[PDB]
């Protein structure tokens, strides 16, 4: 239901899922032959099922086609520093694919939002839902669309008739946790013949 649902969330308030008291198999997520890009840092993509971890943190949101290269540790920009920062010790595993026939429609689908302005930087793994008007000048505006005051939250431009580098890409990241706790969720031993 995280992958296939009726609709998704935005980047300023994304879906947070915790996998506990479960068991899974990462072999069906590799032989799907339906994902566009697949990056998996910190661990090899084919030898992550044998090693066991404690918790799995999965976040799901939408992003454009030209910003899929920004989900990586060690760069600056507009989305990766104001919505979701990536730390240096990031052992996550990002999976992205194109589903332009469901999250977009004719006439202009503007249901998903994003944050453009921010006062300063933010700590990684932190959500920002502040809808306050970012003041640019030195005078207060008291919530008006006048001078030296602009709204940080802006709308998308998703259209299903676009090209390849600007389509709504369903991107998910699977991060692992390492603490003083036994193994909880982990791929077990494959049933051989």
């Amino acid at each position: 239901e995280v992958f296939n649902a009726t609709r998704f969330a935005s980047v300023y308030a994304w879906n947070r899922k915790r996998i506990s008291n479960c068991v899974a198999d990462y072999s069906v997520l590799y032989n799907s032959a339906s994902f566009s890009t697949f990056k998996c840092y910190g661990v090899s993509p084919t030898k992550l099922n044998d090693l066991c971890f404690t918790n799995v943190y999965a976040d799901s949101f939408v992003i454009r086609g030209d910003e899929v290269r920004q989900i990586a540790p060690g760069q600056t920009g507009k989305i990766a520093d104001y919505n979701y920062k990536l730390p240096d010790d990031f052992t996550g595993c990002v999976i992205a694919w194109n589903s332009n026939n469901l999250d977009s429609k004719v006439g202009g689908n503007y249901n998903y939002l994003y944050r453009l302005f921010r006062k300063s930087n933010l700590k990684p793994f932190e959500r920002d839902i502040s809808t306050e008007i970012y003041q640019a000048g030195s005078t207060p505006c008291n919530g008006v669309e006048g001078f030296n005051c602009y709204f940080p939250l802006q709308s998308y431009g998703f259209q299903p008739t676009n090209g390849v580098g600007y389509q709504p890409y369903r991107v998910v990241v699977l991060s692992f946790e390492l603490l003083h706790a036994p193994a909880t969720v982990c791929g077990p031993k494959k049933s051989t013949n």
Partner: antibody
Amino acid sequence: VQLVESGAEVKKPGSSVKVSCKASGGTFSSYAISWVRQAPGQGLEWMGGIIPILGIANYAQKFQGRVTITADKSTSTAYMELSSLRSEDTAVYYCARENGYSGYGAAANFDLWGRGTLVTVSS
Amino acid sequence: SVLTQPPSVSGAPGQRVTISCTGSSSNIGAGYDVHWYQQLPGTAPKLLIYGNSNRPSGVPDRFSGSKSGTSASLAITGLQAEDEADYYCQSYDSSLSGSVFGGGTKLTVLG
């Protein structure tokens, strides 16, 4: 500030209801406005929240496409339209305000509420 | 729905009365903040405490909110003549794609 709503209103089982949300003063065209309902017998549900600046709708997956909420910038008011009423619509709606913040949680809170609109329907 | 609450709780006027809120590992245990409200039968509900760490203007300091892992707790000290209302859990649920409230507890002994 204070949000004033309409009083009691009754309709037919299968008609449309037209209530309003008035705001006294300002700070209405800058923050998100949602609608929280409450019925005697069960808990409190949440239909959706509407941003007045960009005019973007944001509903929940438990409510289907039968209710539409619009906003206005000339008089700073909000309207609620809901048709095809059922037998379990005897509840009260509230015009709430949202004030986001920063932190690890970042959950939507309702600091400012409305008065209340008793919308009952029967034969 | 996903959030359950006890139907009733007993207390004495002068001791500590605590309440417990249990849900799932995706709405309250995932990392989202909890919000407690008071539903008085005859007026509109207001805000009591947000984030379990700050104090709004106009609320007494007798309310204490904490999050112990996957469950949230609310503790009060002293029962005055205005606690005849209901307490709810509000937390952001990702499976429901929005905020969902709890069941609600009634706080009355015998009078």
